[PDB]
């Protein structure tokens, strides 16, 4: 059986760890909801 536990509030926090890049990808989405790269 599955159960839930609260982990926090949904709030934007100023000065949080700024990381990650912004790539533009060619993708495909199948009937099963899985993404794949199109090249």
């Amino acid at each position: 059986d599955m159960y839930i536990e609260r982990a926090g509030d949904i709030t934007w926090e100023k000065d949080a760890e700024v990381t990650g890049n912004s790539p533009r990808l060619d993708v495909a989405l199948d009937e099963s909801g899985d993404f794949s790269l199109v090249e």
């Binding site: 059986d1 159960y3 609260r6 990381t19 890049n21 912004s22 533009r24 495909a28 989405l29 993404f35």
Partner: protein
Amino acid sequence: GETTDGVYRVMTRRLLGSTQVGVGVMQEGVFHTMWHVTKGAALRSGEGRLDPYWGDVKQDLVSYCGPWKLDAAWDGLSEVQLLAVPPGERAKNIQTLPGIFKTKDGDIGAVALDYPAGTSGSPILDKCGRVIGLYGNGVVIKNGSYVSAITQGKRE
């Protein structure tokens, strides 16, 4: 049970110990998560019970106790925050500028942050604090790193 708005961990005692399989958002009495987290199964919240109400495998989304309530969208220009809730670790906001998933049906925002699989369903936010989508469904690129879509439902 517990219907306070906020981010929640989705746990299971079906494997060894207590395992975090995902994360969800509670908003307006409706719990929202990804389909691959619960597979549509019912959830417990103390003594209370949450039964599925809407779900779609292709969209990889599911809502409990009511219709999907989250409708805010990435404006295609501004930075966003991933309120990543990882297994066994505290909820932490991480600011990033989204990339793009270009599909035959149109473009979708994408967050290039890598986290354990049990982090799936962690909300992505705008500067107002509005949930613009859930994190946890994506691809593994040429680099070997993870790029998730900013997956948003539809408010009827």
